């Protein structure tokens, strides 16, 4: 580990955490809209969405149905997913900072010990 290496990840996981957090607030928004619009229609990085259909994969009246549903489920899915992604990014920003400060400290002591070692051998 290098303070410069650790500061890169930290720099970036700090961003990924804010992006991810922002994407959920959006995902919640659309999902609000959707649960309402969903109401009526039944009387007629998105989580494991596209795959769930993909695996098990191998009019209008119903087309608007599967659609009006597949969007509540999706905006639902993206929401929670991005909710845990920043939950993960946060455990990491807190984890990396500790590695950063252990190293930061360690680097300073290591140097001084080198100086002191050389001074003392004169």
């Amino acid at each position: 580990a290098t303070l410069k290496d650790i500061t890169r990840r930290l720099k970036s996981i700090k961003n990924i955490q804010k992006i991810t957090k922002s994407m959920k607030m959006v995902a919640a928004a659309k999902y609000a809209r959707a649960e309402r619009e969903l109401k009526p229609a039944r009387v007629y990085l998105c989580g494991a969405i596209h795959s769930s259909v993909a695996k098990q994969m191998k009019l209008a009246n119903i087309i608007y149905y599967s659609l009006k549903e597949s969007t509540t489920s999706e905006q639902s899915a993206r929401m929670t997913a991005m909710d845990n992604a920043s939950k993960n990014a946060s455990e990491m920003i807190d984890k990396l900072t500790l590695t950063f400060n252990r190293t930061r400290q360690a680097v300073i002591t290591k140097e001084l010990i080198e100086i002191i070692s050389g001074a003392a051998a004169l």
Binding site: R8, R9, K11, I16, I19, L45
Partner: protein, 157 residues
């Protein structure tokens, strides 16, 4: 390191090479965002020279910042506005490499020497969107921009 660190002040121009760039096969491995010259002044090289240079640096910086992020979150969510700078940046990154005449034993390519105007222009056009159709690889290890166009065809199959 105290030595390299102490020497910057004695220079008027600095070319900083990086193993991270070299590692990608981009030679000369100069770091475009850590190299400087005291004459990179509009009053000295001119605004066309200057606006291109800074234009190239902004986009490489813009791309550096996104790198770590599309790494994890991928590229779909990116704005077409932003996936074009990823494009252009990756091509510039290449157009900056060049086969040296003293490293044919290394690159297996004939050395090219490009004149200042062929340089300014080549970059000006990439930045202008004038080659968003050619493939990145066409821009790797070539001299002047015309070789990038020719190389596209050769690669065209």
């Amino acid at each position: 390191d105290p030595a390299p660190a102490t020497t910057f002040a004695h220079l008027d121009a600095t070319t900083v090479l990086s193993r991270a760039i070299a590692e990608l096969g981009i030679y000369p491995a100069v770091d475009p965002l850590d190299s400087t010259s005291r004459i990179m002044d509009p009053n000295i090289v001119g605004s066309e020279h200057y606006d291109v240079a800074r234009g190239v640096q902004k986009i490489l910086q813009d791309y550096k910042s996104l790198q770590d992020i599309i790494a994890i979150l991928g590229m779909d969510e990116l704005s077409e506005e932003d996936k074009l700078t990823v494009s252009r940046a990756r091509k510039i990154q290449r157009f900056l490499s060049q086969p040296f005449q003293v490293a044919e034993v290394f690159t297996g390519h004939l050395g090219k020497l490009v004149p200042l105007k062929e340089t300014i222009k080549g970059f000006q056009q990439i930045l202008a969107g004038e080659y968003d159709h050619l493939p990145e690889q066409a821009f790797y290890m070539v001299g002047p921009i015309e070789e990038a166009v020719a190389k596209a065809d050769k690669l065209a199959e």
